[PDB]
Symmetry: C2
Subunit: 304 residues, 2 copies
């Protein structure tokens, strides 16, 4: 009932370990812990046989390019989460950061293994030859520009875009494409386990980011202004344009039976809008999205 | 390029042996919420003397002194060895340290030691321990690769490989010899394995640096390591006096613990080609040779009767 006249912010350093000022962190770490997995649990022999015998050029191409697009984000040093404590110096945020950081190394190892197993290391090494990828790297660098910024204004914008695009949306069209092969044709079941587990992790990461973003709004309403949002939406709209072109590239040998480009665009636009709601930003696209409403239950079924 | 130079391409790894350590952690993965201490609190209440209770309590406070903290070292090794595989190793060990801080924070909570832990700096020997630990860690953020390397050596051989291990040994002795504190010993056993993996990962890195920059291991560095370790062993010996402040206990003896620590130091020094310091006799280090066996035993549907 009684508001304090003064308090320490999320940007100030609490030295004592417990109690946690942001105890809900444990919901996110415990969810990662419960979902803990590594790629060494999985054998891809059946998938390679399905691939070899029963997929068309168009289908194989979608699988290859969807995995290349996933690896473009996942097979990399992704230092964001490991450094959040430099910005939010609370013990529980080192906990959240380190938990998500370790998770990202499990991801990089899993996708690095998939590239090896399917014989795409060469295409991956030369992926910057693809125009739409050069363009995705450009938008990603713009999300990431202020991730190590001492300016807390500019760090918070990096965090919104990281949480809403990179964690919640950039990969998810590829995850759906891959899951569709298992859903509708019963193929690539082992790849779909990896995909589903990654989806579960990434949703947790996105929500963790959202949580922090809302704690920052709850404490600093003034940085959540007019010109900030002009950056957010411009950047987001533009990011979808690039992800739409990624889909054109993924299906460059033709559309496939199990999933369609149009429905995936509405899937991404819907997912964005739904996360903007959660950080009290009004929607951009306002979406059709029932087409890929099966995603969440297919993730659950392939999680085992 | 060397271990200190950035490599952009994820694979192949230049230091592939990283995966032996991350895989070890993965296979040993655990969270404290797998363990319940109700039976331990009953053992403690009913079946431990004051002397024993005090050794349990003080061993746990000493462990918490190190474990219940933000331990930033492993999470930032990538800043010094900017390789994808060291970001992997770092983040894996960094997450492990958060599992540790939650485990020991929970133990303090359950046994009712939060207040004593808040006031732990009132203990003189704890302040001296804080002093040697701050000296070990002082250059952990250094841009000077030589200074940083020395902090790594001391971190690995003292803080990971030794500082905690006498407290681990004390706690496991209750389970081994009296069958008490079994669930505590599970946590201890799991922590012991983790910290051994951390220590060995540090040893791995140190030797890669030795291979690529043999000049860094100079006479001044070996002298500083040797002298710091000696001082640190003197402090840990005195920590044992405080641990047993209400009297000697039956399950384990200070003298065997000091020899255990000295031996562990020498074995780590050998692995990084630094002359041994204590040269402990086989008859002395065999006293706690059970340690490894007891770690293994405590690191691992329904059966019933009707009439
Ligand atoms: Mg860092
Ligand atoms: Mg020399
Ligand atoms: Mn990921
Ligand atoms: Mn992520
Ligand atoms: Mn630890
Ligand atoms: Mn450790």
């Amino acid at each position: 009932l009684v508001p304090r006249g003064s308090h320490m912010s999320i940007f100030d350093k609490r030295v004592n370990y417990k109690p946690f000022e942001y105890p809900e962190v444990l919901q996110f770490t415990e969810a990662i812990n419960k979902a803990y997995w590594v790629h060494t649990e999985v054998d891809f022999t059946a998938d390679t046989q399905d691939f070899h015998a029963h997929l068309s050029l168009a289908e194989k191409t979608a699988v290859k390019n969807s995995l290349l697009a996933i690896a473009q984000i996942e097979v990399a040093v992704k230092s964001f989460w490991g450094n959040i404590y430099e910005h939010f110096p609370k013990p529980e945020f080192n906990g959240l950061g380190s938990t998500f950081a370790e998770c990202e190394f499990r991801h990089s190892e899993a996708y690095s293994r998939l590239l090896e197993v399917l014989g795409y290391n060469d295409e991956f090494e030369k992926l910057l030859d693809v125009p739409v990828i050069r363009r995705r790297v450009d938008y990603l660098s713009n999300v990431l520009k202020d991730t190590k910024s001492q300016d807390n204004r500019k760090y918070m914008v990096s965090l919104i875009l990281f949480s809403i695009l990179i964690e919640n949306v950039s990969l998810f069209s590829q995850f759906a494409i891959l899951l569709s092969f298992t859903r509708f044709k019963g193929y690539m079941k082992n790849v779909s386990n990896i995909i589903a587990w990654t989806s579960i992790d990434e949703q947790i990461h996105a929500n963790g980011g959202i949580y922090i973003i809302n704690k920052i709004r709850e404490e600093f309403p003034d940085y959540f202004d007019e010109e900030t949002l002009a950056l957010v939406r411009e950047t987001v709209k533009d990011s979808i344009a690039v992800e739409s072109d990624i889909l054109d590239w993924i299906f460059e040998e033709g559309e496939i039976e199990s999933i369609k480009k149009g429905d995936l665009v509405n899937f991404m636009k819907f997912r964005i809008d739904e996360s903007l709601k959660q950080i009290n930003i009004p929607v951009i696209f306002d979406v059709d999205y029932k087409a890929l409403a099966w995603f969440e239950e297919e993730v659950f079924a392939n999680s085992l």
